[PDB]
Amino acid sequence: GDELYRQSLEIISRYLREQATGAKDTKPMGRSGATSRKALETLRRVGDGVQRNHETAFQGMLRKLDIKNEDDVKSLSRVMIHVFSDGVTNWGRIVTLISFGAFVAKHLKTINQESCIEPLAESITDVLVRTKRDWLVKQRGWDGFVEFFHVED
């Protein structure tokens, strides 16, 4: 859904691509870029931590998923939604979702399937924005995300 979707995709795509390669995208963001930059910095901090602390569970999940190609990415929606929509809603779960997205993006890079990353990012965004739309809006979106993880300074 429009601006929230566009911003969300921009953030999630840049994070996954950045994580898969070692490259930081210089191209401009768009309509709320300052916030998106802060969200991206926040992701570098918190998302990387989530990947280290959960590497075993993540490895298990990647293993069960058996992702080899773009069709495998395109068929993830139902598991993704099933795991994500269960339980409580908080920013930590959104971080887990995106962070596993990065874990997968690195795997895709490893097996020379870089082209799958952008569809992956799209799928995650679709899931996030459809399942949590009203909550995300109530939390002031990515502004709420940056504030939630703001490190007192």
What is the contact surface with ligand 4M7 in residues (CB under 6 A)? 57-58, 61, 76, 79-80, 83-84, 93, 96-97, 100-101, 104, 124
How far is Cα 16 from Cα 21, in angstroms, rounded to an integer?
9
Which of 41, 30, 126, 42 lies closest to 76, judged by CA? Answer: 126
Of 29 and 80, CB closest to ligand 4M7? 80
Of 32 and 139, CB closest to ligand 4M7? 139
CB of 87 vs ligand 4M7, minimal distance in Å: 7
CB of 98 vs ligand 4M7, minimal distance in Å: 7
Of 32 and 132, CB closest to ligand 4M7? 132
